[PDB]
Write a protein that binds this ligand. Structure first.
Ligand SMILES: Cc1cc2nc3c(=O)[nH]c(=O)nc-3n(C[C@H](O)[C@H](O)[C@H](O)COP(=O)(O)OP(=O)(O)OC[C@H]3O[C@@H](n4cnc5c(N)ncnc54)[C@H](O)[C@@H]3O)c2cc1C
Lengths: 661, 132, 8
């Protein structure tokens, strides 16, 4: 459908009212089914209209115009629905031509810490609602963890690189509003072992299938067996994978044992039979001579001498029958024994070479979560799974910076302004910053509200880069402590000519040791110009930041030579190496669900702080200190769309507070 | 609902979890157990190689040709006396006694056992066979 | 998170 597909593109159920809607429309959701379908249609339709043309403001009037009866009947209902959507940033978000120019008379003052996507998204929304907004940014540029390298025609993202599908992604709307060159990623990714030899197709498929089965096993181990605590400590995903692997090694051994144990049971049947056949051959030999002697008494003989010949003859054909029946039973136990020797169980679970290739699939998982698997919560690492977008993953050939730079237009942004202290009281806030260039030049910003978009890395920093006065409550600081903030670096290799398969976007390099599985484990070509991006993931990321760009480009060229040959790999024209853990305006790459945390901490990070009263016995103050950023959005963490959506959320929560709902 | 080609019982998990080196311990216990079963194979198949040796030639040297003698209804004095001695050496094994005489079916042996019972004191002959 | 995995 069109109306139902607009609900889906807005991450809303088309046929049901959300918790947020129930809060703003209690009269409707608590009332009769008919009115709700009217609500749901008006909502779904308003969204459809915005999405069909997101380059110009959708006004209340424009909405009512294009609504057919009986849905245009109730004009207040349509006005409530339109206002809700506009406020919560489901319509008229991003960069659109405004119909009615914004009124010169501004209500309320907000300081936004950081001009990353979360910051910029919020700032636009608040200005749209007619608040006075100022962003304080420590860097000499906007975008934050969206960082794009540019020298001549060379263009390469050191931060966010990938749109993780357009199906329900609000970056779909932004891509129409801003010229981004979105290019699909071809899923074909050949591996190449330590030497330079592509993994054999049969083996590649075999390890990849084992990896998925190993993961699926950790989930079963987590949910069905409830193996989520061990020694009064939360179970890591790494721990669960070790334990699942060990149990697979145990089963390989247990299998061999049961197989050999049934070979000895057969060899001991055979021994018992051969012993019986040897003793019977002796009794046949002994009894044959007896008959030979008795029959060598030539006739004529009395009847006792005749009987002796006959009785011994009978007795000997009997024992010769038994031995022939036993020699049959011998033959079938020798067939059975030759079959068990022919069909042995597996010698080993995984060879040294298989374990190295499996370690690449673990590196890939350590890249995705930007952290060693030993840090990830087994139970909750994938807690955002149900909200993933549909459609092909794409890259920005333009460079992702095109997006923030666009969002920054028309906004009061103080660059080279490092927030040092955030003061919040019953009567308002003071934000104290300094010039990054000369730390002595001090600035004081007075505001009704502060929106903090400081990365979780910065919030974690001990001792603190930013002082809160009064200090943040235990419930907030405990969440900051618990939550994971990961690391993941990129090496940009700019060449003069393409020496790689230009229809292959990805290709892996398998590390020799487990300890270095992350080290330059993957290479991207996604750009018009000849550029390769090497990821440094897992435990490698932290360690490789203490090693110089020359040595890193060194290890890079080596690995590429091994695959393409010394004659094909030139010196690079330009090289850049990200060091995100050392970057003091990031202190890492993005959030992960650490062992001992859950999605619930993402919600704690998003809860605003309400100061105490100035004079005692004074009424409960309004909230002053708000939080946005990828670490604040439980359902879309560690993404640009997550940051974007977190900004829009806080802009609505602040407007509701300071302009009324 | 475990995955196909993965084995994960509550017992095994607890047994690798129970200790900090239980994993490596449980695996060597089986490695040693596997060596002990593989040496027991070498032993018993070297034992069995030796017995297959002592059987070399089968029983073909000690195998006697088959008698094709056509079963007859007329009881000769020879046959009567073979029978009494067969009753003496064997018991009521009517099959063996027929095999000895070589031209009397198991039926005729069963018949004989009552027809002549009075005259060949077969009751006394069976008592003598039971004593030994 | 999971979303970022390659070769899915
Ligand atoms: C290597 C890498 C790859 C990624 N790949 C992807 C991807 O493919 N797809 C995707 O969707 N997401 C990706 N992400 C995540 C994405 O970049 C972030 O989730 C998002 O940009 C976070 O935006 P934010 O506004 O929450 O934080 P930021 O972008 O960090 O913005 C916060 C701002 O605060 C500023 N600041 C810090 N300290 C101070 C201070 N004391 N005073 C003032 N200002 C301060 C910073 O300079 C910054 O501008 C990636 C991240 C990294 C690091």
């Amino acid at each position: 459908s069109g109306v139902e597909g607009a609900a889906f593109q807005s991450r809303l159920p088309h046929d049901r009212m959300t918790s947020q809607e129930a809060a703003c429309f209690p009269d409707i959701i608590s009332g009769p089914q008919q009115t709700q379908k009217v609500f749901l249609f008006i909502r779904n339709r308003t969204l459809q209209l915005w999405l069909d043309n997101p380059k110009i403001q959708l006004t209340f009037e424009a909405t009512l115009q294009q609504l057919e009866a009986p849905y245009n009947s109730d004009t207040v209902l349509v006005h409530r629905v339109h206002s809700y959507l506009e406020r919560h940033g489901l319509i008229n978000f991003g960069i659109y031509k405004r119909i009615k120019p914004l009124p010169t008379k501004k209500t309320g003052k907000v300081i936004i810490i950081g001009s990353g996507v979360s910051g910029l998204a919020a700032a636009r929304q608040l200005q749209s609602f007619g608040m006075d907004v100022t962003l304080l940014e420590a860097r000499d540029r906007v975008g934050g963890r969206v960082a794009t390298f540019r020298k001549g025609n060379y263009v390469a993202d050191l931060g966010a690189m990938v749109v993780t599908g357009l199906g329900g992604n609000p970056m779909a709307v932004v891509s129409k509003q801003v010229n981004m060159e979105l290019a699909k990623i071809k899923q074909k990714c050949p591996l190449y072992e330590a030497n330079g030899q592509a993994v054999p197709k049969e083996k590649d498929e075999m390890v990849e299938q084992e990896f998925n089965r190993l993961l699926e096993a950790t989930s079963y181990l987590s949910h069905q067996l409830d193996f989520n605590v061990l020694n009064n400590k939360p179970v890591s995903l790494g721990q669960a994978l070790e334990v699942v692997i060990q149990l697979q090694e145990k089963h390989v051994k247990d299998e061999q044992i049961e197989h050999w144990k049934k070979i000895v049971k057969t060899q001991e049947e055979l021994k018992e039979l051969l012993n019986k056949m040897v003793n019977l051959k002796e009794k046949i030999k002994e009894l044959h001579q007896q008959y030979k002697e008795a029959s060598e008494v030539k006739p004529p003989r009395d009847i006792t001498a005749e009987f002796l010949v006959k009785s011994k003859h009978r007795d000997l054909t009997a024992l010769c029958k038994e031995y022939d029946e036993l020699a049959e039973t011998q033959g079938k136990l020798e067939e059975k024994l030759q079959e068990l020797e022919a069909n042995p169980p597996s010698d080993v679970y995984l060879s040294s070479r298989d374990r190295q290739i499996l370690d690449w699939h673990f590196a890939n998982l350590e890249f995705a979560n930007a952290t060693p698997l030993s840090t990830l919560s087994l139970k909750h690492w994938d807690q955002d799974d149900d909200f993933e977008f549909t459609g092909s993953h794409l890259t920005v050939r333009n460079g992702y910076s095109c997006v923030p730079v666009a969002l920054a237009e028309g906004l009061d942004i103080k660059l080279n302004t490092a927030v040092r202290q955030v003061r919040y009281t019953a009567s308002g806030c003071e934000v104290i910053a300094v010039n990054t260039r000369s730390t002595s030049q001090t600035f004081i910003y007075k505001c009704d509200a502060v929106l903090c978009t400081l990365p979780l890395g910065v919030l974690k920093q001990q001792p603190p880069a930013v002082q809160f006065v009064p200090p943040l409550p235990e419930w907030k600081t405990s969440a900051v402590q618990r939550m994971g903030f990961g690391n993941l670096n990129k090496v940009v290799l700019c060449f003069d000519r393409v020496f790689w398969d230009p229809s292959v976007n990805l290709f892996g390099h398998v590390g020799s040791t487990t300890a270095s599985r992350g080290e330059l484990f993957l290479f991207w070509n996604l750009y018009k110009a000849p550029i390769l991006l090497a990821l440094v993931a897992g435990e490698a990321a932290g360690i490789m930041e203490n090693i110089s760009d020359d040595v890193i480009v060194g290890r890079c060229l080596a690995i590429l030579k091994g695959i393409f040959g010394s004659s094909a790999v030139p010196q690079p024209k330009e090289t850049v190496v990200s060091r995100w853990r050392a970057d003091p305006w990031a202190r890492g790459s993005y959030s992960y669900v650490a062992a001992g945390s859950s999605g619930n901490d993402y919600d704690l990070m998003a809860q605003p702080i309400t100061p105490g009263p100035s004079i005692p016995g004074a009424p409960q103050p309004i909230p002053r200190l708000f939080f946005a950023g990828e670490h604040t959005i439980r359902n879309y963490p560690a993404t640009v769309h997550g940051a974007l959506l977190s900004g829009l959320r806080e802009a609505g929560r602040i407007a509701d507070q300071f302009l009324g709902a | 609902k475990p995955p196909k080609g993965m084995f994960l019982s509550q017992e095994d998990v607890e047994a690798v979890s129970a200790n900090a080196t239980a994993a490596t311990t449980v695996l060597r216990q089986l490695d040693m157990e596997l060596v002990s079963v593989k040496r027991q194979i070498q032993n018993i198949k070297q034992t069995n190689s030796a017995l297959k040796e002592k059987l070399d030639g089968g029983i073909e040297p000690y195998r006697l040709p088959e008698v094709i003698q056509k079963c007859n209804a007329r009881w000769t004095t020879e046959e009567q006396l073979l029978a009494v001695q067969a009753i003496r050496k064997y018991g009521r094994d009517f099959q063996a006694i027929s095999d000895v005489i070589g031209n009397k079916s198991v039926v005729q042996v069963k018949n004989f056992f009552v027809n002549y019972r009075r005259r060949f004191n077969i009751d006394e002959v069976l008592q003598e066979w039971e004593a030994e | 998170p999971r979303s970022f995995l390659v070769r899915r």
